[PDB]
Design a protein around this ligand. Structure first.
Ligand SMILES: Nc1ncnc2c1ncn2[C@@H]1O[C@H](COP(=O)(O)OP(=O)(O)O)[C@@H](O)[C@H]1O
Ligand SMILES: [Mg+2]
Length: 398
């Protein structure tokens, strides 16, 4: 906190910095205009970033920015792909306007594809914020069951974006449509994964019939980093199910080349480079981040603390079940359900409906008392929203 760094940013430059392993870093815009991943920074506001945060503060006109704290790295980059990300947004709004003049209108749908650590989530965040700043309400679709920015790991989720992402905490998670996949990787159950995003695409298509702003708002869809083998036809089916107009490929020439020949001719295909500010995460970093995502789901953030309940549930009051390829199996309260997430299915009964039903939310089984026939759960709300609890293979040690 007694260590300050001052930076001058010319137009079209970004301050890339990573917070230390131990320290927070406070960022303040002191002159000009700046944005962090598409969200405008307010002049003279203090943004505290937690340890190990990797952030870029970009400026369209020029800015002076102050960093307070211990940084692992901090420099001004003069070359960025930010204008590319702007033009993609500009192209979408052009499609919105052309479709709008038939009075309703269906907004452009965009599929982001590529391997891990290309800045795919970052770009999806930028594109959503720009649509919001344009006055539109896009639907952000999260297909990455490994690193999910809307719900917990092992989920396919979609959210209506009505406000720009918070600089620190990201997008508001206001009433998301969440499907429980139950695995960190699509390879664990390929056919179920495909059935879920098809059920996602169908649910959204019926719901945009009742919301005009959401329909014209369009979709920005983040896929997972699985591009090889079975991950490829998985991209093709995602493009098909969601009826996308544009596919953006980040930093993968072969994938771009393969898709150029298999995609329907009406689909626009754009290859873009990854930002020099994106760096390769190791396996254990993603694993650690999944646990931090689970913690965030129950306990919230520093800015918005959530207060989860810890109460006991009788095994008589609930039906525990597991999806396992697409058949449903009823679970008998074992010791092995401990530390596992469970989804509150929107289905009233534990039958065929569970497979394709969205969920109310999640709980974490913390204790299992087989001799008392009770379990301890961590839950976002006072009472359980559903008697049907669906097994997730994701484990969290709180
Ligand atoms: N221009 C940039 N400068 C600095 N860090 C960045 C930049 N773009 C992305 N990052 C950071 O790199 C990390 C990985 O980005 P992410 O979008 O999650 O990649 P992917 O979704 O493709 O795995 C994130 O922590 C993000 O904040
Ligand atoms: Mg990602």
């Amino acid at each position: 906190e007694e260590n300050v760094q001052e930076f001058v940013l010319k137009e079209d430059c970004e301050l890339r910095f990573a917070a230390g392993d131990d320290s927070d870093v406070c960022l303040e815009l002191v002159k000009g205009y700046a944005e962090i991943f598409g969200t405008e920074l307010l002049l003279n506001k203090k943004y505290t970033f937690p340890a190990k945060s990797r952030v870029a503060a970009f400026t369209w006109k020029g800015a002076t920015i102050e960093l307070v704290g211990t940084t692992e790295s901090a420099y001004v980059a003069e070359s960025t792909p930010m204008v590319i990300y702007l033009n993609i947004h500009a192209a979408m709004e052009e499609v919105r306007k052309k479709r709008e003049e038939q009075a309703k209108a269906k907004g452009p749908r965009l599929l982001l594809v590529g391997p891990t650590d290309v800045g795919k989530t970052t770009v999806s965040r930028i594109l959503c914020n720009y649509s919001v700043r344009q006055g539109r309400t896009p639907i952000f679709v999260e297909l990455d069951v490994g690193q999910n920015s809307v719900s917990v790991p092992g989920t396919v989720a979609a959210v209506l974006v009505q406000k720009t992402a918070d600089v620190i905490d990201g997008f508001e998670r206001n009433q998301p449509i969440v499907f429980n996949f139950g695995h960190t990787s699509p390879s664990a159950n390929l056919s179920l994964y495909e059935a879920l995003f098809k059920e996602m695409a169908t649910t959204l298509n019926a719901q945009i019939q009742e919301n005009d702003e959401a329909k014209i708002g369009g979709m920005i869809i983040n896929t997972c980093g699985w591009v090889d083998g079975e991950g490829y036809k998985c991209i093709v089916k995602a493009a098909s199910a969601f009826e996308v107009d544009v596919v953006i490929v980040l930093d993968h020439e072969r994938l771009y080349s393969d898709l150029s020949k298999e995609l329907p001719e009406f689909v626009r295909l754009t290859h873009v480079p990854k930002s020099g500010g994106v760096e390769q995460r190791t396996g254990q970093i993603r694993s650690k981040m999944r646990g931090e995502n689970v913690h965030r789901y129950f306990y919230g953030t520093r800015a918005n603390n959530l207060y989860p309940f810890t109460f006991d549930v009788s095994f008589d009051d609930v039906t525990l079940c597991k999806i396992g390829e697409t058949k449903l199996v009823i679970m008998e309260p074992s010791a092995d359900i401990k530390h596992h997430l469970f989804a509150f299915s929107r289905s009233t009964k534990a039958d065929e409906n569970v497979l394709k039903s969205p969920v109310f939310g999640f709980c974490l089984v913390t204790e299992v008392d087989l001799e008392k026939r009770t379990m301890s759960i961590l839950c976002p709300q006072r009472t359980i929203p559903s008697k049907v609890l669906v097994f997730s293979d994701i484990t969290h040690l709180d």
